[PDB]
Amino acid sequence: MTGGKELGAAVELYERLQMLSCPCLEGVYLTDPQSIYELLCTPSSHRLDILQWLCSRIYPPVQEQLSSLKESQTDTKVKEIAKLCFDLMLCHFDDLDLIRGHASPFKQISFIGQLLDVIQYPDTISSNVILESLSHSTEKNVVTCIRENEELLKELFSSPHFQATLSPECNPWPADFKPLLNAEESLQKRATQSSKGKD
Amino acid sequence: MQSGSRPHLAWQREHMWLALQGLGFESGAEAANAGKTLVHVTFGVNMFDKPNKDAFYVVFHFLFGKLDNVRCKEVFRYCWPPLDKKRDAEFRKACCEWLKKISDEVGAGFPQVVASIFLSPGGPKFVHLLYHFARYVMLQHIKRDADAGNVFISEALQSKIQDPQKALARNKLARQKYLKVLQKENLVIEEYQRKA
Amino acid sequence: MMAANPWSPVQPSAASLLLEKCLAAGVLSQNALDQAQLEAPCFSHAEELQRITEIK
Amino acid sequence: VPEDMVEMIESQTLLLTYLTIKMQKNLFRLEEKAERNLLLVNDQKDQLQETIHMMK
Protein backbone atom coordinates (compact mmCIF):
# COMPACT_ATOMS: atom_id res chain seq x y z
CA MET A 1 0.00 0.00 0.00
CA THR A 2 1.82 3.05 -1.39
CA GLY A 3 1.67 5.43 1.52
CA GLY A 4 0.35 9.10 1.02
CA LYS A 5 4.05 10.45 1.07
CA GLU A 6 5.28 8.33 -1.88
CA LEU A 7 2.25 9.33 -3.90
CA GLY A 8 2.98 13.00 -3.22
CA ALA A 9 6.64 12.60 -4.18
CA ALA A 10 5.67 10.83 -7.35
CA VAL A 11 3.38 13.69 -8.21
CA GLU A 12 6.16 16.16 -7.70
CA LEU A 13 8.43 14.22 -9.93
CA TYR A 14 5.66 13.91 -12.51
CA GLU A 15 5.34 17.70 -12.47
CA ARG A 16 9.02 18.18 -12.96
CA LEU A 17 8.94 15.83 -15.86
CA GLN A 18 6.13 17.77 -17.43
CA MET A 19 8.06 20.98 -17.04
CA LEU A 20 10.97 19.44 -18.91
CA SER A 21 8.54 18.68 -21.96
CA CYS A 22 9.49 14.97 -21.83
CA PRO A 23 8.26 13.50 -25.20
CA CYS A 24 7.22 10.33 -23.45
CA LEU A 25 4.53 12.17 -21.60
CA GLU A 26 3.05 13.70 -24.72
CA GLY A 27 -0.67 12.78 -24.89
CA VAL A 28 -0.45 11.29 -21.30
CA TYR A 29 -2.33 13.56 -18.71
CA LEU A 30 -2.59 11.77 -15.38
CA THR A 31 -4.41 13.55 -12.58
CA ASP A 32 -4.52 10.46 -10.21
CA PRO A 33 -1.35 10.30 -7.91
CA GLN A 34 -1.59 6.43 -7.99
CA SER A 35 -1.52 6.42 -11.86
CA ILE A 36 1.47 8.78 -11.73
CA TYR A 37 3.16 6.49 -9.25
CA GLU A 38 2.39 3.32 -11.38
CA LEU A 39 3.83 5.19 -14.40
CA LEU A 40 7.10 6.13 -12.72
CA CYS A 41 7.73 3.30 -10.10
CA THR A 42 6.22 0.07 -11.62
CA PRO A 43 7.92 -1.96 -14.31
CA SER A 44 6.65 -0.92 -17.82
CA SER A 45 8.01 -0.29 -21.28
CA HIS A 46 6.98 3.38 -20.74
CA ARG A 47 9.03 3.73 -17.58
CA LEU A 48 12.05 2.42 -19.42
CA ASP A 49 11.34 5.02 -22.24
CA ILE A 50 11.31 7.75 -19.60
CA LEU A 51 14.55 6.62 -17.99
CA GLN A 52 16.08 6.31 -21.48
CA TRP A 53 15.02 9.81 -22.13
CA LEU A 54 16.40 11.10 -18.84
CA CYS A 55 19.72 9.42 -19.43
CA SER A 56 19.87 10.74 -23.12
CA ARG A 57 19.42 14.18 -21.71
CA ILE A 58 22.20 13.82 -19.18
CA TYR A 59 24.56 11.97 -21.47
CA PRO A 60 23.53 12.40 -25.25
CA PRO A 61 26.09 9.80 -26.76
CA VAL A 62 24.18 7.08 -25.00
CA GLN A 63 21.19 7.70 -27.22
CA GLU A 64 23.11 6.29 -30.36
CA GLN A 65 24.16 3.28 -28.35
CA LEU A 66 20.63 2.45 -27.20
CA SER A 67 18.77 3.18 -30.44
CA SER A 68 20.92 0.47 -32.25
CA LEU A 69 19.56 -2.23 -29.92
CA LYS A 70 16.46 -4.24 -31.22
CA GLU A 71 13.27 -4.36 -29.00
CA SER A 72 14.02 -8.20 -28.37
CA GLN A 73 17.16 -7.08 -26.40
CA THR A 74 15.51 -5.25 -23.52
CA ASP A 75 17.90 -6.94 -20.90
CA THR A 76 20.95 -5.46 -22.66
CA LYS A 77 19.36 -1.95 -22.62
CA VAL A 78 18.75 -2.22 -18.90
CA LYS A 79 22.41 -3.23 -18.32
CA GLU A 80 23.72 -0.19 -20.36
CA ILE A 81 21.57 2.23 -18.37
CA ALA A 82 22.74 0.66 -15.09
CA LYS A 83 26.36 1.10 -16.22
CA LEU A 84 25.80 4.85 -16.92
CA CYS A 85 24.07 5.35 -13.68
CA PHE A 86 26.93 3.62 -11.89
CA ASP A 87 29.37 5.98 -13.62
CA LEU A 88 27.20 8.89 -12.26
CA MET A 89 27.35 7.39 -8.73
CA LEU A 90 23.59 6.92 -8.38
CA CYS A 91 23.44 3.07 -8.06
CA HIS A 92 25.53 -0.18 -8.17
CA PHE A 93 26.35 -1.63 -11.65
CA ASP A 94 24.18 -4.87 -10.90
CA ASP A 95 21.18 -2.93 -9.54
CA LEU A 96 19.00 -4.03 -12.44
CA ASP A 97 15.85 -4.16 -10.26
CA LEU A 98 16.02 -0.36 -9.73
CA ILE A 99 16.05 0.29 -13.46
CA ARG A 100 13.26 -2.24 -14.12
CA GLY A 101 11.15 -0.60 -11.43
CA HIS A 102 11.14 -3.54 -8.76
CA ALA A 103 13.06 -1.54 -6.11
CA SER A 104 11.39 0.06 -3.10
CA PRO A 105 9.12 3.09 -4.09
CA PHE A 106 11.32 5.46 -2.04
CA LYS A 107 14.37 4.22 -3.63
CA GLN A 108 12.75 4.72 -7.04
CA ILE A 109 11.54 8.18 -6.29
CA SER A 110 14.87 9.19 -4.90
CA PHE A 111 16.59 7.71 -7.91
CA ILE A 112 14.37 9.52 -10.53
CA GLY A 113 14.62 12.61 -8.37
CA GLN A 114 18.33 12.67 -8.58
CA LEU A 115 18.28 12.17 -12.35
CA LEU A 116 16.03 15.14 -12.64
CA ASP A 117 18.33 17.20 -10.46
CA VAL A 118 21.06 16.84 -12.88
CA ILE A 119 18.91 17.84 -15.90
CA GLN A 120 17.44 20.88 -14.14
CA TYR A 121 20.79 22.01 -12.92
CA PRO A 122 20.56 25.80 -12.97
CA ASP A 123 22.93 26.60 -15.61
CA THR A 124 24.43 29.75 -13.91
CA ILE A 125 24.63 33.41 -15.32
CA SER A 126 25.50 33.86 -18.91
CA SER A 127 22.97 31.90 -20.54
CA ASN A 128 20.53 34.54 -21.67
CA VAL A 129 21.89 33.52 -25.11
CA ILE A 130 18.77 31.83 -27.13
CA LEU A 131 19.18 29.62 -30.42
CA GLU A 132 22.38 29.90 -31.76
CA SER A 133 24.99 27.24 -32.62
CA LEU A 134 24.46 23.55 -31.45
CA SER A 135 28.04 23.22 -32.32
CA HIS A 136 29.64 24.50 -29.23
CA SER A 137 32.52 22.01 -28.49
CA THR A 138 32.04 19.89 -25.04
CA GLU A 139 35.42 21.50 -24.16
CA LYS A 140 34.09 25.06 -23.36
CA ASN A 141 31.41 23.70 -20.94
CA VAL A 142 33.89 21.62 -18.99
CA VAL A 143 36.22 24.54 -18.52
CA THR A 144 33.45 26.66 -17.15
CA CYS A 145 32.25 24.01 -14.66
CA ILE A 146 35.75 23.46 -13.39
CA ARG A 147 36.19 27.13 -12.92
CA GLU A 148 32.94 27.54 -11.02
CA ASN A 149 33.57 24.52 -8.88
CA GLU A 150 36.97 25.82 -8.01
CA GLU A 151 35.47 29.07 -6.82
CA LEU A 152 32.91 27.25 -4.69
CA LEU A 153 35.39 24.99 -3.05
CA LYS A 154 37.74 27.90 -2.42
CA GLU A 155 34.97 29.76 -0.70
CA LEU A 156 33.77 26.79 1.26
CA PHE A 157 37.21 26.00 2.65
CA SER A 158 38.13 29.66 3.34
CA SER A 159 35.21 30.03 5.64
CA PRO A 160 35.63 29.78 9.54
CA HIS A 161 32.27 27.95 9.68
CA PHE A 162 33.19 25.21 7.35
CA GLN A 163 34.55 22.84 10.06
CA ALA A 164 31.43 23.31 12.17
CA THR A 165 29.17 22.15 9.27
CA LEU A 166 31.08 18.82 9.10
CA SER A 167 30.22 18.13 12.77
CA PRO A 168 27.17 20.07 13.67
CA GLU A 169 26.39 20.62 17.45
CA CYS A 170 23.39 22.18 18.95
CA ASN A 171 22.31 22.33 22.59
CA PRO A 172 19.35 24.60 23.11
CA TRP A 173 18.45 23.48 26.68
CA PRO A 174 19.13 25.45 29.88
CA ALA A 175 20.92 23.98 32.97
CA ASP A 176 17.72 23.28 34.87
CA PHE A 177 16.66 20.72 32.14
CA LYS A 178 19.99 18.80 32.19
CA PRO A 179 18.88 16.44 34.90
CA LEU A 180 15.82 15.60 32.76
CA LEU A 181 17.81 15.13 29.65
CA ASN A 182 20.58 12.92 31.37
CA ALA A 183 17.92 10.91 33.07
CA GLU A 184 18.01 6.93 33.38
CA GLU A 185 17.49 4.63 30.33
CA SER A 186 14.02 3.77 31.88
CA LEU A 187 12.50 7.23 31.24
CA GLN A 188 13.74 7.14 27.72
CA LYS A 189 11.93 3.88 27.08
CA ARG A 190 8.72 5.22 28.54
CA ALA A 191 8.91 8.38 26.31
CA THR A 192 9.62 6.44 23.08
CA GLN A 193 6.91 3.77 23.72
CA SER A 194 4.24 6.41 24.29
CA SER A 195 4.55 7.62 20.59
CA LYS A 196 3.40 4.40 19.02
CA GLY A 197 0.18 5.44 16.73
CA LYS A 198 -2.63 3.36 18.56
CA ASP A 199 -2.97 6.24 21.09
CA MET B 1 63.35 19.61 -27.92
CA GLN B 2 64.52 20.46 -24.54
CA SER B 3 62.22 19.54 -21.98
CA GLY B 4 59.40 21.85 -20.92
CA SER B 5 58.28 21.72 -17.33
CA ARG B 6 54.86 20.00 -17.69
CA PRO B 7 52.21 22.52 -16.30
CA HIS B 8 50.58 19.29 -15.04
CA LEU B 9 51.45 19.46 -11.25
CA ALA B 10 50.10 22.95 -10.21
CA TRP B 11 46.36 22.12 -9.50
CA GLN B 12 47.32 18.80 -7.67
CA ARG B 13 49.11 20.99 -5.03
CA GLU B 14 45.89 22.95 -4.40
CA HIS B 15 43.52 19.99 -4.21
CA MET B 16 45.91 18.18 -1.88
CA TRP B 17 45.68 21.06 0.53
CA LEU B 18 41.84 21.05 0.26
CA ALA B 19 41.81 17.36 0.91
CA LEU B 20 43.90 17.77 4.18
CA GLN B 21 41.52 20.41 5.37
CA GLY B 22 38.53 18.35 4.44
CA LEU B 23 40.00 15.46 6.51
CA GLY B 24 40.28 17.86 9.45
CA PHE B 25 43.87 19.06 9.18
CA GLU B 26 44.48 22.00 11.55
CA SER B 27 47.89 23.57 11.20
CA GLY B 28 48.10 24.70 14.93
CA ALA B 29 46.86 21.45 16.45
CA GLU B 30 48.92 19.10 14.24
CA ALA B 31 52.15 21.10 14.55
CA ALA B 32 51.78 20.97 18.34
CA ASN B 33 51.40 17.22 18.15
CA ALA B 34 54.80 17.02 16.34
CA GLY B 35 56.52 19.36 19.29
CA LYS B 36 57.03 22.13 16.72
CA THR B 37 55.87 25.76 17.11
CA LEU B 38 53.96 27.46 14.07
CA VAL B 39 56.73 30.20 13.82
CA HIS B 40 59.14 27.76 12.21
CA VAL B 41 56.96 25.53 10.03
CA THR B 42 55.23 26.79 6.78
CA PHE B 43 51.96 25.02 5.94
CA GLY B 44 49.89 25.67 2.67
CA VAL B 45 49.63 25.09 -0.91
CA ASN B 46 53.33 25.83 -1.55
CA MET B 47 54.69 24.10 1.67
CA PHE B 48 56.75 21.50 -0.42
CA ASP B 49 57.95 23.83 -3.21
CA LYS B 50 61.19 23.76 -1.26
CA PRO B 51 62.23 20.74 0.69
CA ASN B 52 60.33 21.09 3.92
CA LYS B 53 61.21 18.39 6.48
CA ASP B 54 59.02 19.62 9.26
CA ALA B 55 55.77 19.66 7.18
CA PHE B 56 56.59 16.19 5.89
CA TYR B 57 56.54 14.82 9.44
CA VAL B 58 53.29 16.42 10.38
CA VAL B 59 51.14 15.81 7.24
CA PHE B 60 52.18 12.18 6.77
CA HIS B 61 51.64 11.32 10.41
CA PHE B 62 48.20 13.01 10.09
CA LEU B 63 47.15 11.12 6.94
CA PHE B 64 48.40 7.76 8.39
CA GLY B 65 46.47 8.62 11.44
CA LYS B 66 43.37 9.31 9.43
CA LEU B 67 43.83 6.08 7.46
CA ASP B 68 44.44 3.75 10.50
CA ASN B 69 44.90 5.42 13.75
CA VAL B 70 45.74 2.11 15.60
CA ARG B 71 48.39 1.11 13.08
CA CYS B 72 49.75 4.62 13.02
CA LYS B 73 50.46 4.61 16.75
CA GLU B 74 52.03 1.13 16.57
CA VAL B 75 54.33 1.77 13.43
CA PHE B 76 55.62 5.14 14.72
CA ARG B 77 55.75 4.40 18.54
CA TYR B 78 59.41 4.52 18.76
CA CYS B 79 60.27 7.13 16.16
CA TRP B 80 57.41 9.82 16.65
CA PRO B 81 58.10 12.58 17.05
CA PRO B 82 61.41 12.59 14.92
CA LEU B 83 63.66 14.59 17.33
CA ASP B 84 67.13 12.94 16.69
CA LYS B 85 69.04 11.65 13.53
CA LYS B 86 68.34 8.05 14.50
CA ARG B 87 64.52 8.61 14.86
CA ASP B 88 64.33 10.62 11.67
CA ALA B 89 65.94 7.78 9.64
CA GLU B 90 63.51 5.30 11.21
CA PHE B 91 60.44 7.57 10.52
CA ARG B 92 61.37 7.90 6.83
CA LYS B 93 62.03 4.19 6.54
CA ALA B 94 58.67 3.45 8.12
CA CYS B 95 56.71 5.96 5.93
CA CYS B 96 58.38 4.47 2.75
CA GLU B 97 57.59 0.83 3.86
CA TRP B 98 53.96 1.66 4.61
CA LEU B 99 53.34 3.63 1.42
CA LYS B 100 55.13 0.87 -0.68
CA LYS B 101 52.60 -1.59 0.70
CA ILE B 102 49.75 0.81 -0.26
CA SER B 103 51.32 1.31 -3.70
CA ASP B 104 51.53 -2.61 -4.14
CA GLU B 105 47.96 -3.05 -3.03
CA VAL B 106 46.39 -0.27 -5.21
CA GLY B 107 48.75 -1.30 -8.37
CA ALA B 108 49.07 0.89 -11.60
CA GLY B 109 47.15 3.94 -10.26
CA PHE B 110 49.48 4.88 -7.41
CA PRO B 111 52.97 6.42 -8.04
CA GLN B 112 56.10 4.23 -7.53
CA VAL B 113 57.56 4.81 -4.01
CA VAL B 114 61.36 5.12 -3.95
CA ALA B 115 63.36 5.80 -0.70
CA SER B 116 65.31 8.71 -2.37
CA ILE B 117 61.99 10.83 -2.45
CA PHE B 118 62.00 10.96 1.41
CA LEU B 119 65.67 12.14 1.80
CA SER B 120 64.75 15.56 0.60
CA PRO B 121 60.92 15.79 0.87
CA GLY B 122 60.08 18.44 -1.69
CA GLY B 123 59.46 18.92 -5.35
CA PRO B 124 56.90 17.86 -7.96
CA LYS B 125 57.46 14.10 -7.56
CA PHE B 126 56.97 14.37 -3.84
CA VAL B 127 53.72 16.53 -4.19
CA HIS B 128 52.43 14.08 -6.74
CA LEU B 129 53.00 11.23 -4.29
CA LEU B 130 51.33 13.15 -1.35
CA TYR B 131 48.24 14.07 -3.43
CA HIS B 132 47.57 10.47 -4.40
CA PHE B 133 48.17 9.51 -0.77
CA ALA B 134 45.55 12.09 0.39
CA ARG B 135 43.11 10.96 -2.27
CA TYR B 136 43.53 7.38 -1.12
CA VAL B 137 42.83 8.30 2.47
CA MET B 138 39.56 10.11 1.41
CA LEU B 139 38.34 7.18 -0.64
CA GLN B 140 38.91 4.89 2.42
CA HIS B 141 36.90 7.27 4.46
CA ILE B 142 34.05 7.32 1.93
CA LYS B 143 34.09 3.48 1.92
CA ARG B 144 33.96 3.30 5.73
CA ASP B 145 31.49 6.10 6.24
CA ALA B 146 29.24 5.17 3.36
CA ASP B 147 26.27 3.09 4.56
CA ALA B 148 26.08 -0.60 3.38
CA GLY B 149 23.92 0.74 0.37
CA ASN B 150 26.37 3.50 -0.82
CA VAL B 151 29.55 1.48 -0.73
CA PHE B 152 29.28 1.50 -4.56
CA ILE B 153 30.13 5.19 -4.56
CA SER B 154 33.77 4.42 -3.55
CA GLU B 155 33.97 1.86 -6.47
CA ALA B 156 32.56 4.32 -8.97
CA LEU B 157 35.14 7.00 -8.01
CA GLN B 158 38.00 4.49 -8.45
CA SER B 159 36.82 3.62 -12.03
CA LYS B 160 38.70 6.32 -14.17
CA ILE B 161 36.14 8.08 -16.58
CA GLN B 162 37.91 9.07 -19.75
CA ASP B 163 34.81 10.91 -21.32
CA PRO B 164 34.65 14.64 -20.19
CA GLN B 165 30.87 14.84 -20.55
CA LYS B 166 30.29 11.94 -18.19
CA ALA B 167 32.69 13.47 -15.63
CA LEU B 168 30.83 16.79 -15.76
CA ALA B 169 27.47 15.20 -15.12
CA ARG B 170 28.81 13.23 -12.21
CA ASN B 171 30.28 16.41 -10.68
CA LYS B 172 27.02 18.28 -11.00
CA LEU B 173 25.26 15.62 -9.09
CA ALA B 174 27.80 15.66 -6.33
CA ARG B 175 27.56 19.43 -6.04
CA GLN B 176 23.85 19.31 -5.68
CA LYS B 177 23.90 16.59 -3.09
CA TYR B 178 26.22 18.67 -0.96
CA LEU B 179 24.02 21.73 -1.11
CA LYS B 180 21.02 19.74 -0.07
CA VAL B 181 22.63 18.26 3.03
CA LEU B 182 23.96 21.72 3.94
CA GLN B 183 20.43 23.13 3.77
CA LYS B 184 19.02 20.23 5.72
CA GLU B 185 21.47 20.83 8.47
CA ASN B 186 20.28 24.37 8.85
CA LEU B 187 16.67 23.35 8.95
CA VAL B 188 17.08 20.62 11.59
CA ILE B 189 18.99 23.00 13.93
CA GLU B 190 16.48 25.75 13.49
CA GLU B 191 13.53 23.52 14.13
CA TYR B 192 15.15 21.92 17.20
CA GLN B 193 15.82 25.33 18.76
CA ARG B 194 12.28 26.47 18.19
CA LYS B 195 10.64 23.47 19.65
CA ALA B 196 12.87 23.41 22.64
CA MET C 1 26.94 42.95 8.24
CA MET C 2 23.57 41.64 9.26
CA ALA C 3 24.16 41.92 12.98
CA ALA C 4 22.53 38.74 14.39
CA ASN C 5 19.88 40.15 16.62
CA PRO C 6 21.19 38.59 19.92
CA TRP C 7 17.54 38.27 21.09
CA SER C 8 16.36 35.90 18.26
CA PRO C 9 15.52 32.60 19.85
CA VAL C 10 17.09 30.80 17.00
CA GLN C 11 20.84 31.24 16.76
CA PRO C 12 22.17 30.95 13.29
CA SER C 13 23.75 27.56 12.46
CA ALA C 14 27.17 27.14 11.02
CA ALA C 15 25.41 25.94 7.86
CA SER C 16 23.42 29.04 7.53
CA LEU C 17 26.47 31.32 8.09
CA LEU C 18 28.33 29.28 5.41
CA LEU C 19 25.45 29.51 2.93
CA GLU C 20 25.24 33.23 3.47
CA LYS C 21 28.91 33.60 2.84
CA CYS C 22 28.60 31.60 -0.41
CA LEU C 23 25.74 33.66 -1.66
CA ALA C 24 27.61 36.97 -0.80
CA ALA C 25 30.66 35.74 -2.85
CA GLY C 26 28.24 35.19 -6.00
CA VAL C 27 29.47 31.59 -6.18
CA LEU C 28 26.00 30.32 -5.33
CA SER C 29 22.67 31.79 -6.49
CA GLN C 30 19.52 31.76 -4.42
CA ASN C 31 17.84 30.03 -7.42
CA ALA C 32 20.29 27.22 -7.11
CA LEU C 33 19.49 26.92 -3.38
CA ASP C 34 15.73 27.07 -3.91
CA GLN C 35 15.87 24.28 -6.44
CA ALA C 36 17.67 22.21 -3.92
CA GLN C 37 15.01 22.77 -1.13
CA LEU C 38 14.21 19.56 0.73
CA GLU C 39 10.98 19.60 2.44
CA ALA C 40 11.96 16.73 4.73
CA PRO C 41 9.93 16.78 8.01
CA CYS C 42 12.01 17.01 11.08
CA PHE C 43 11.03 15.42 14.58
CA SER C 44 7.68 13.68 13.48
CA HIS C 45 7.33 11.65 16.65
CA ALA C 46 7.53 14.67 18.95
CA GLU C 47 4.78 16.37 17.00
CA GLU C 48 2.40 13.47 17.33
CA LEU C 49 2.74 13.40 21.14
CA GLN C 50 1.90 17.11 21.25
CA ARG C 51 -1.38 16.53 19.48
CA ILE C 52 -2.41 13.72 21.77
CA THR C 53 -1.75 15.88 24.84
CA GLU C 54 -4.07 18.60 23.52
CA ILE C 55 -6.92 16.24 22.86
CA LYS C 56 -6.58 14.79 26.33
CA VAL D 1 40.02 17.66 -23.69
CA PRO D 2 43.36 17.34 -22.26
CA GLU D 3 43.45 14.16 -20.03
CA ASP D 4 44.46 16.79 -17.36
CA MET D 5 40.92 18.53 -17.24
CA VAL D 6 38.96 15.35 -16.69
CA GLU D 7 41.32 14.50 -13.77
CA MET D 8 40.64 17.90 -12.10
CA ILE D 9 36.85 17.57 -12.26
CA GLU D 10 37.12 14.11 -10.77
CA SER D 11 39.21 15.45 -7.94
CA GLN D 12 36.46 18.12 -7.26
CA THR D 13 33.78 15.47 -7.35
CA LEU D 14 35.73 13.42 -4.82
CA LEU D 15 36.02 16.43 -2.40
CA LEU D 16 32.33 17.30 -2.58
CA THR D 17 31.20 13.76 -2.21
CA TYR D 18 33.45 13.24 0.80
CA LEU D 19 32.11 16.40 2.46
CA THR D 20 28.59 15.36 1.75
CA ILE D 21 28.84 11.84 3.28
CA LYS D 22 30.73 13.18 6.28
CA MET D 23 28.02 15.85 6.96
CA GLN D 24 25.06 13.53 6.47
CA LYS D 25 26.38 10.94 8.98
CA ASN D 26 26.98 13.61 11.69
CA LEU D 27 23.60 15.33 11.00
CA PHE D 28 21.61 12.09 11.44
CA ARG D 29 23.24 11.59 14.88
CA LEU D 30 22.15 15.09 16.00
CA GLU D 31 18.60 14.67 14.72
CA GLU D 32 18.20 11.44 16.68
CA LYS D 33 19.60 13.02 19.88
CA ALA D 34 17.36 16.03 19.43
CA GLU D 35 14.13 14.09 18.94
CA ARG D 36 14.90 12.00 22.02
CA ASN D 37 15.41 15.14 24.07
CA LEU D 38 12.10 16.63 22.86
CA LEU D 39 10.14 13.51 23.69
CA LEU D 40 11.58 13.41 27.21
CA VAL D 41 10.59 16.97 27.87
CA ASN D 42 7.20 16.48 26.31
CA ASP D 43 6.48 13.60 28.62
CA GLN D 44 7.24 15.81 31.63
CA LYS D 45 4.79 18.34 30.32
CA ASP D 46 2.12 15.72 29.99
CA GLN D 47 2.44 14.53 33.64
CA LEU D 48 2.20 18.05 34.98
CA GLN D 49 -0.84 18.73 32.87
CA GLU D 50 -2.70 15.70 34.22
CA THR D 51 -1.94 16.59 37.83
CA ILE D 52 -3.18 20.16 37.38
CA HIS D 53 -6.38 18.97 35.84
CA MET D 54 -7.17 16.58 38.67
CA MET D 55 -6.55 19.27 41.28
CA LYS D 56 -8.83 21.69 39.41
From Swiss-Prot, chain D:
The cellular location(s) given in this protein's UniProt record come to:
Cytoplasm; Cytoplasm, Cytoskeleton, Microtubule organizing center, Centrosome; Cytoplasm, Cytoskeleton, Spindle; Cytoplasm, Cytoskeleton, Spindle pole
Coiled-coil spans are: 29-56
Q: So which domain of life are we looking at?
A: Eukaryota
- Quaternary data: Component of the HAUS augmin-like complex. The complex interacts with the gamma-tubulin ring complex and this interaction is required for spindle assembly. Associates with microtubules. The interaction with microtubules is strong during mitosis, while it is weak or absent during interphase. It is unclear whether this interaction is direct or indirect.
In which family does this protein belong, per the annotation?
A: Belongs to the HAUS8 family.
Q: What function does the entry list?
A: Contributes to mitotic spindle assembly, maintenance of centrosome integrity and completion of cytokinesis as part of the HAUS augmin-like complex.
Q: What name appears for this protein in its UniProt entry?
A: HAUS augmin-like complex subunit 8
> Which residues of the full-length protein are shown here?
155 to 210 of 367
